[PDB]
Amino acid sequence: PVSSLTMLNDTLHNIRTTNQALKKELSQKTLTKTSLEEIALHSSQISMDVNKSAQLLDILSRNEYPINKDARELLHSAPKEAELMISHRELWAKIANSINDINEQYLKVYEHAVSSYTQMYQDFSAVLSSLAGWISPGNSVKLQVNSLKKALEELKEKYKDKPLYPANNTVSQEQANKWLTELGGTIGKVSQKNGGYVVSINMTPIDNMLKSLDNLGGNGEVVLDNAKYQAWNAGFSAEDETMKNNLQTLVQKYSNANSIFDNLVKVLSSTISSS
């Protein structure tokens, strides 16, 4: 019975409470405008509760509170991402930083990638809804190619300096590349920003659209045969699924990174409930 362990126990259970609430927001076909808003609240609550836990874990380290051998056996179940015969104080510190780096440099990375790509695909879906106003039938089908390319080109522009990672500032090539491999070379692309690098959104799906439109020819508005229209729309709809699957990929990488962080808490919570 120690106040620091009790306050830690309760803070960790409040984390597992937020983790579950975030798993709900992440399992929905549509990540609406509100979905990102909810994801932000839970993330900010996790961040400040992890900060409180660290401050509590710090107390336990400097005071060298014992971690019984019956409890050190449970820290083996901690995910290998946590990086867990060492001193009592060194192990409490080896946790406060573990739980803190699992959030800043691991969990929150997937969070921003999701939001960055969610915003991008949200704005693209607006181009999708506005296609009704750029396609007129007469078979015959008139297409406002210029208006559509301008829309897609300004989508690329609006997100050139909004990378999947990092959220702020830059990182090293070996750091941008190491995260590119985890997210996917098809969803992102390392890019130079000022002196360092980032993991920018990969806009190849939109680039492919612009190439297909340039191939339709014409000098502005283009009238297609019925077969030439179903052909274009098929490739334009296939690129839509590519981005929709790219986003589903990030969501799973995020919810899985949450399940890991959650088990790092489940293990920790059971490690203090004993000691």
């Epitope: 405008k33 990102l36 607006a126 181009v127 208006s147 301008k150 300004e154 609006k158």
Partner: nanobody, 116 residues
Framework: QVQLAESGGGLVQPGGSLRLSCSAS????????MGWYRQAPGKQRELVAS?????????NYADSVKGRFTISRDNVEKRVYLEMNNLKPEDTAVYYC?????????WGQGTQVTVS
């Protein structure tokens, strides 16, 4: 070039509400960030609501307006809306609608909104 035209103004009593509407015609409506402005007699122009291009997820309002106005956009029909609830006398002004993207800016003539 984009042509803007606002409609829906008029006289209301304090606590009343309006449905301000701006219809656009011309360029690519979807790429422009929209924003409603107002200028009361004598006083200086003011930004009241703003919405970004495309889906329009990002919106912020002036402190004197939050919770009462709401800005939305219809890319399909190419119109910008500003529903105004619980209107106060200080909300009296000519409300203009702005389409903006980098240095590109387009304006409608604006509607009068009087609350008394």
């Amino acid at each position: 070039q984009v042509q803007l035209a606002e409609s829906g103004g008029g006289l209301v009593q304090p606590g009343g509400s309006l449905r301000l509407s701006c219809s656009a015609s011309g360029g690519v409506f979807i790429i422009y960030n929209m924003g409603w402005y107002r200028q009361a007699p004598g006083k200086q122009r003011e930004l009241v609501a703003s919405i970004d291009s495309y889906s329009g997820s990002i919106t912020n309002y002036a402190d004197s307006v939050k919770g009462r106005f709401t800005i939305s956009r219809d890319n399909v029909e190419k119109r910008v809306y500003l529903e105004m609830n619980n209107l106060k006398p200080e909300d009296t002004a000519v409300y203009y609608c702005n389409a903006n993207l980098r240095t590109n800016n387009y304006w409608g003539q604006g509607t009068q909104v009087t609350v008394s």
